[PDB]
């Protein structure tokens, strides 16, 4: 099992890798909205999808949570 | 293995999480590009990789699909 | 044991297929910069942001090569 809970151990840190690389294009694509933003629908789209991934953001992060807690088991 | 299945399982959902997350900031880059296209080859690396990304989405989607299905198995 | 390994595999590879997503909106990312930049802080913070990522997806493929080592073992 030692090497059994190791890949997964791996699979659970790389998918906390790749949720903070989704957070920091996160805040890397608010500062290019603010950006564009400095010179209709197209604001009420922006925040529809930023809230909608601002949400699947979070539940991913507690997602990421209980599988640290479940694999610590 | 229940609690086996149950790890697995989160690794699963958390993998359709980010999935979901990165399609939802490609809706934003997609507007985010529009905003500023309202204002060369610039245009040509744009489409050669908005290709490439909803090339990558797709598989995973499917890759998801097969994941789930696996585990319900 | 087979089937075992066979979900684990299509979880690392879709792994894979989310880092290379995560990468080619990172491209685009960057090509939204540009745009934006052919027309203050403002300019730090995608900086230290474009750094962040580049860090974090360096670290994510290192770990998805490991995570595919440990799985052929």
Known sequence: TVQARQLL???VQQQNDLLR???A???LLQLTV?????????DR???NYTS?????IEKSQ????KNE???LE
Do not use: F, P, T, V
């Not at 909608?52 to 699947?56: A, C, Q, R, T, V």
């Not at 507690?62 to 949570?65: D, I, P, V, Y």
């Open 45 to 47: 789209e922006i925040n």
């Open 69 to 71: 807690q479940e694999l």
């Open 21 to 23: 690389a989704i957070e």
């Open 25 to 27: 294009q996160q805040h």
């Open 52 to 56: 909608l991934i601002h949400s699947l």
């Open 62 to 65: 507690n997602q990421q949570e």
């Open 9 to 11: 151990s791996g699979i």
């Open 34 to 42: 603010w950006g564009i933003k400095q010179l209709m629908e197209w």
